Symmetry: D2
């Protein structure tokens, strides 16, 4: 039942790179008002890999306060370490999330076997919340086969899969093998094609600023209005071109700033600031998005 | 006017692995009768890189004889040699094909300038026929930037682009920059998602045995009937699943053999024979495709 | 003067997966006694990416306690966060390490400028200790070009380069551009070839169990005995062949366990344990290394 | 006894892009006089993949005619087709070649079983002539594992391996497994390290203009003069640095032109010219290669 359009929450930092809590609550509220189905918290987009476990627990707790039962809450609880994820998995329950998630452990080369035990351990610590297996070869460098994906997605406790892959053949194969699985599209750029291939919904960072567009694409496809599904996608794509040039996280934070949601558009070092040349475009887009 | 669902044509060899002229013709006519929009001849699917120029020119002449005027005919004329490519391009004009096409020359690491001059030299020899730029990084090993792709797609005399890539963000990007461009989807497994992302047609190998499902998806999307564009794409993928186990060129030749179109389902060595274990499955496929 | 045969220190854990302090001191001392030039501490081998900052900081303290003034001591301070890296860089200075080192930040795609800034930021925090730029493309995913390596190596503060790469052409180009640069060979299996190509020392994990052999390779080549240099290199490769099968860190921790250096040969989950079939081979290896 | 330092011959063309037999004869003679142990004809360096069988068979003739008895002779006979390869294998024997060689067929993805079969067929047609497996992952994109290489290297009729990989751990596992095997180092830039890892000689393209330097490295390691072995390799590497700038084949033919050996220094298209700006240096290189 945790199927839908969900924003991969950005984590606002202040001038000295400390977590900015007011803008977090603010971004959460903004995201709710916009009409998004839920929030995926603490993932790549939430700059998790550049924060401590306690900073991560903090953000989890705050978005929980803010988000109770208004929307669906999902905690990316993953670290390279099983114990650390298990700790975050525990907090997630404590704070009342609806599920927990974890990237396939990166950097060190682990065996599929060790990946499966890792998921199992977290699911165990999640004490009840379903798991959302997180696939993203680009960043994790972990290449999974369809067989391995069938095995992972069948572990008891696993309730959904976040496909952050542009392979839409594999997308249809996964839907083919698992008709009832909540399969989420990870690349915003190909959202419409991912849904025609079998995704139920999607989790994305650009959902923070024009979430209604993606909600729009689903409506158009459900009604067979393909040309307007194509219109919304290309409009989303002209934004993604810009964001990729400016750097996605920082660029997103910038627009959100011009929308008076995020006090400081800073990402944490080693991320660098947005190039001044890009502001004109970013303010113009912040303005326009207030459509 | 190169828009359409066009079959990437297999070339039948006899028991002594020499060209089988009777089955080629049987295969041309089979396609024509299947209502395919046209044929792309002499490509990878055609085992072109395992034949001599003469053998290649021969199939050109034979399918022109059989096809000229009934359907659209594109000639894959590319070799690693520019000189040889030109020879085949001149013959394609001579034989009366509607366009000429060529893979980015592979094996040696040429430069993009080198690649541009290469297409220029052939376009020339094609003495009037539109060039179809054929992108297939997988097999060729050439990773073209979208900027690079724009330079080629706008090179004087170029009329289309065979996108054999699964990168569908890049599909919509090309469509966005070139709204009047004939863009063929190259990976059958994602045909429907390719069209949605931008392709206006496609050239694929599995069209030889089920060209109608592919033409059906085009219809279903035009209609706004996604549920059946999906039903059909999964019907195609179940086939592709099998074909990949057995070997796509030999498995297509086998299913077509059981369909009484091709005499010997042999590919040239180094390709090997279909594993007998799959013969009963392919036998079955041929049978049910006579639907 | 940070040239030499340096061991990449393993960090021993107990039954509960907590740092095993006693075994660590024992391991620090084993290396000292085996005659190694120094220790590189808190690296990949040291499972730094699977422990906390305080743990990492703990290990640095203890090894500085144990080995200060006895051998060269380089601290891997690296993290994804520049701020976390800065924290540990300041500690390394406080405990009295000789150099500070940092992997190119991973997971997120950072620009080369962002990488330079990252090193500058850490170098600043090291307040005087030189920096050993650590190039490990396979694990990190950061493909640096030679030019990029030339820039990073010329940054004020940088005194050495840890080339954990098998490209031995780039090894001599680096040596050719930088005659005074300390250039450590990162891949133990190619040690002898790496010294022939320009490396002047090396840092390696296997140095923990048979450091005396790489010392021999350095002696051999200096003395022009390529017969023993090859003799030792194949002997080392025979063990490496094994370790790769068993899993390198765990495999090495088991060998040291049978050498009575390490109490519990465990690695932190996600790593699984050594497979029972390797026990007799490792047991037998540990016994013959007592040579 | 086909252990040695073999030059991968260049194939000279005329202004018209046809063969300059006059210069080929001169090239063969120049390498002989240089002191090369043998010649490898019709490989990538001999622009074989941009030549017809007849042109390749013609080059096989003229050099057998010009160098039989004087030096060792190895005909590269590989084509993607087993048949075209077999045809050339037969001619190699006919013209009296010492050995035969074939690159792992490329472009279409073939299985290992298919590769083994291909080699057997060629081995069969060379009717007694030993086969030199030609491994070159970079240009062919065929990735063989150590086990696969072990199987190829033990196929009956196989006499040697041309290792065109910079993986010097693999070099030594091959030497370790097969102590009697003739192992040719394929990357000129790492020749000295390739030999210290296990190779007994090399087949390289830069040998045409400075083969003596490569003989000197063999002499150097033989005598345990690693210092002059290193001096020599950096001399070779500075040439390689430039050559990679100009384009290696075109650049080789140009210095050879300034050396009077090759009349016209063209490569066949798709290769373009040496950019005008390199002429001075290449001219200068040839000037100094008269050492």
């Amino acid at each position: 039942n945790l199927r839908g359009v969900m924003a991969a929450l950005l984590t606002p930092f202040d001038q000295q790179q400390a977590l900015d809590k007011a803008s977090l609550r603010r971004l959460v509220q903004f995201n709710i008002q916009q009409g998004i189905d839920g929030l995926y918290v603490g993932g790549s987009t939430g700059e998790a890999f550049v924060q401590s476990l306690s900073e991560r627990e903090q953000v989890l707790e705050i978005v929980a306060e803010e988000g109770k039962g208004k929307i669906k809450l999902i905690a990316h609880v993953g670290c390279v370490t099983t114990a650390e994820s298990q700790q975050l998995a525990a907090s997630a329950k404590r704070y009342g999330f609806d599920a927990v998630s974890a990237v396939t452990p990166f950097y060190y080369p682990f065996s599929f076997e060790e990946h499966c035990d890792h998921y199992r351990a977290i699911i165990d610590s999640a004490d009840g919340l379903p798991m959302v297996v997180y696939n993203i070869p680009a960043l994790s460098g972990v290449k999974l086969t369809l067989d391995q994906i069938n095995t992972l997605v069948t572990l008891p406790g696993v309730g959904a899969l976040k496909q952050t892959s542009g392979d839409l053949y594999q997308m249809e194969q996964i839907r083919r093998e698992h008709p009832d699985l909540v399969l989420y599209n990870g690349y915003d750029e190909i959202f419409a094609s991912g849904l025609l291939a079998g995704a139920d919904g999607g989790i994305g960072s650009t959902y923070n600023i024009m979430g209604w567009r993606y909600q729009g694409i689903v409506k158009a496809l459900k009604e067979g209005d393909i040309q307007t599904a194509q219109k919304l996608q290309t409009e989303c794509n002209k934004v993604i071109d810009l964001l990729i040039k400016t750097g996605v996280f920082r660029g997103l934070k910038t627009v959100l700033h011009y929308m008076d949601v995020v006090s400081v558009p800073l990402c944490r070092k080693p991320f660098g600031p947005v190039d001044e040349k890009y502001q004109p475009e970013l303010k113009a887009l912040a303005q326009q998005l207030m459509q």
